[PDB]
Symmetry: C4
Subunit: 314 residues, 4 copies
């Protein structure tokens, strides 16, 4: 069967209201990044050199999520960034480790000095590592996870991007603690255009979720988040958290520099968004509203007691 | 089954002509708001602070429909507005109460002084009350209906916005006299965007209708009416009446103020539409034409003897 | 079953090539308007006051089709127009009656003097009459056909616009010689917008055709023709001929007046198209090409030996 | 069954990642044009007078593909062009014949002197011939193949454009060595617009492929290639190679002349693309990336071990 099935994106679907007993304000946004690391808000900042470095990591950890420092920098640079976050100086939801230090992660891809990079990152006391690949379901990435897990047994791992059930089983089999889902979710995406490859996000999430169900392996929904409603759908589909890049690129904390163009403000050029905190408030508000609509008091309820209708567009 | 089914909006559907015996001019637009209150034309003006106050209420009641005064005002203000309508000074279709006073309704939402608001509204002799909620299928709204119906047994109630059969059963169970259907009908709608929640209007209407069928509970189709054809489809789907906001926002009677911008006219800014009466004539004309096409002499015939074909767009 | 089925427009479908033995130039465009009146090219000019009067009628009859004089004029005027065509003064395909006079038809709708109008039209020796209604499936139109067929037994009749099998049976039952199919074929169409009524053209044609099959009643596909490819699809769906309005509105022969706007030319304002003959050549060429692709030597072959694939757009 | 099925274009589909063991750089782009002629890269330059003449043919053959000289020129001219390519003077992938001369093909259509044209082309030592027709599934083209194969038994033939299984069987039956697939793939295409004929490319390819499977007859996917991802999908659907026109029209080597418009560069007017070699590098890169995503080391693996999901758009 060449054409296996129809895949759904965020816009091909909508959530059906349910009898509710909770108000958006009584809802809990706590979730799991891994079985060992929880988050206070289900958001992660992308490992893009355009969105996450020490300032973004600190800002979002103080809000309850976690930032993943990008790998497009020297090994020394990446270590220092981790240390900046870890040695930081009200924020009720701040996410800290058992040593009261702000949480933070770092991305790494296959290179000649990956092991060397990881070693330095672990010395900086990074909380979690992201094996960053465009195609996580590969023999090279599988072997890379094995090596890292043998050399650093207690280092939590989020394994490369996948969109299938078979990929989830393989990565889990070698110790992946969390699976990051997301490959060619949109027609405008580079993988879809260049390689003609990819699977719509809702189907992607539902697929790996319908595989990792009953297990203690978490799921991160990475990419394509345009609105708070997308976060709601991503979690209802089965994600434990969501990784965001674009929507944060214009914030003050992004690695970019602030530019004032004829009375207007930008980051360089994307329009200024203000403190990350403001965008996050907007996003958690929408998530809470959505949970109110579905009668979910926790993230876990949103994932199990939720149903969609297919949108014939128009 | 996560993805329960495909939902239809107004544009995903079209009505199939039927053998007709009546001319658009011989058709009756009479319908029911509740089992105790009928209307001469199946239209209601939205409880939006941008469309319905005393002037809109009077204008549409004189035409045969009913206006619902918005709640974004003091309790004293809302009472006075009701009195203005009720103490008003040819219009053959005017809709009046047994005391020959123009019909009028008022919206109320959950607040610290809802009961207090209702008391004053009932003193003003309001004909019907709208429990205004974005999510009517909630324990708080259900309890609110119980309280209001115990304190004011003869006050007709339209209960919060719903899009499901289960919600219809719950609200009906506590005395709702009419159900207002409408939640995230369009992708551009705030609930769909912010909360990722919502169900296309035709499916929404068909769903609660296919539940309240055989009962004496009426249905109001609220929101998304862009053209007269949408009204026809809404009723054919099962609605007894339709609530309109946007299309009336530019009329003279809307709470807005008239503004003349360089030779053009506006309401503030939406383009001027003229007397509500003119827009209504356009809307009832289209409804009559549609009923002529389906051989329906009454609103009731439009709802039972009507079928759609699904539009594959294009 | 409220939502009976999915209906198809011209764009939701495409024709599948077949083994061909004929060249576009060896193909025959001859078809039937009624069992008694044939045409040399399967085209009719719309009974719109913006496209068909004596000049359009003459021009298209000289090409092999037939024009239908619109009814938006006095009874005396409409009679004279018929006479102008009938008393006209190389064109190998010219379509003439047994008396060597150019063919021509006239539209008539329900009015106080329809019978009176017809009488004068019949005196002018009109070849065929069009009972022009937006909803042909009505008791009034059915009775009108009965009356006309009793008072003028040999007058060929095309009966009002329909889109259903039941309508086809009723109109046929009272003597309709040809059925004109076409109601709310497009979302932008006035009936779809105003009355929320209508059925996509391909399904409409297929539907009445799959009813009038095996009978001697012909089918005219009226409206929505934008390209020559639409004509091909319309006939493959089951039409014997196609009625065109818009595409002819800009021709020299249309009732409009020629206007020169800053070096450009128009009809009043639609852009000038030139002699009808030129547009017709373009349209018959495309039809012939399409028949070549399907191995159809005649119109009849195009209708029976033809299959479509559904276009999922994109 | 008038409406046989739903057909898919490039955009209605996306490829599903698979467990991979190969890196894009370790992949082999070698493929077959016919059982007797292989190519080093699965690309052909269109037989359009706007893209392929001696310069385009040389450029792409030096890269590993083959150019097909267009037929819109005198027989003498077309012969000379072949000779220029065949007598050409690092490029590791160059595609040459057993005599170390650059490969090249030539298009021919039904005319009064087709046989005469072929004779001269064969004297020029053309490697393969393209029977160029808009509708290859015709008795005239079938007879033309028979004649050419009797007069030139060792001349490899690519037979006219088809989109069906029945056409593939007929052309194969008279000696076609390769089948070129492609007719009205897009709604904007001239055949779809003018003749209302055509079948989406993915379904077209899958259809003839699911017929020529298990045979030694190759398939060329001709037309509609906008991005490298389209090439990947075309091959995964069953094509052995892909014919490209538009994307090459702006290259330096195209028959066009270079024009500098106010600081910008063009070909005449389409924007300059630079050396074909650069566009090809972009296209083979995307193909390799796509093969990496599917774990295909060869073109053959891409065709057999590949699956798509249907894109509900949005």
């Amino acid at each position: 069967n060449k054409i296996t099935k129809e895949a759904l994106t965020f816009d091909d679907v909508s959530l059906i209201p349910r009898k509710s007993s909770v108000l958006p304000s009584e809802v809990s946004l706590k979730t799991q990044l891994t079985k060992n690391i929880s988050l206070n808000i289900p958001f992660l900042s992308s490992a893009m050199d355009t969105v996450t470095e020490s300032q973004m990591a600190i800002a979002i950890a103080k809000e309850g999520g976690i930032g993943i420092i990008h790998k497009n920098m020297s090994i020394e640079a990446q270590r220092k960034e981790i240390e900046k976050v870890k040695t930081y100086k009200d924020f009720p939801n701040a996410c800290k480790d058992l040593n009261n230090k702000l949480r933070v992660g770092a991305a790494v891809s296959i290179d000649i000095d990956t092991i060397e990079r990881v070693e330095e990152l672990v010395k900086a006391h990074v909380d979690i590592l992201v094996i960053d690949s465009a195609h996580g379901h590969s023999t090279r990435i599988i072997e890379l996870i094995k090596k890292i897990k043998t050399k650093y047994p207690n280092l939590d791992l989020i394994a490369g991007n996948i969109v299938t059930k078979e990929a989830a089983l393989d990565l889990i089999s070698v110790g992946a603690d969390c699976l990051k889902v997301g490959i060619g979710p949109g027609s405008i995406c580079t993988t879809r255009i260049v390689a003609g490859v990819g699977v719509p996000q809702i189907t992607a999430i539902c697929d790996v979720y319908e595989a990792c169900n009953n297990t203690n392996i978490c799921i991160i929904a990475d990419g394509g988040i345009r609105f708070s409603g997308d976060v709601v759908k991503a979690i209802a589909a089965g994600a434990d958290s969501v990784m965001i890049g674009n929507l944060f690129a214009g914030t003050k904390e992004s690695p970019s520099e602030e530019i004032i163009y004829n009375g207007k403000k930008f980051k360089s050029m994307v329009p200024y968004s203000g403190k990350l905190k403001d965008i996050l408030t907007q996003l958690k508000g929408g998530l809470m509203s959505g949970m109110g609509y579905l009668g979910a008091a926790t993230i876990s309820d949103l994932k199990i007691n939720s149903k969609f209708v297919k949108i014939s567009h128009s």
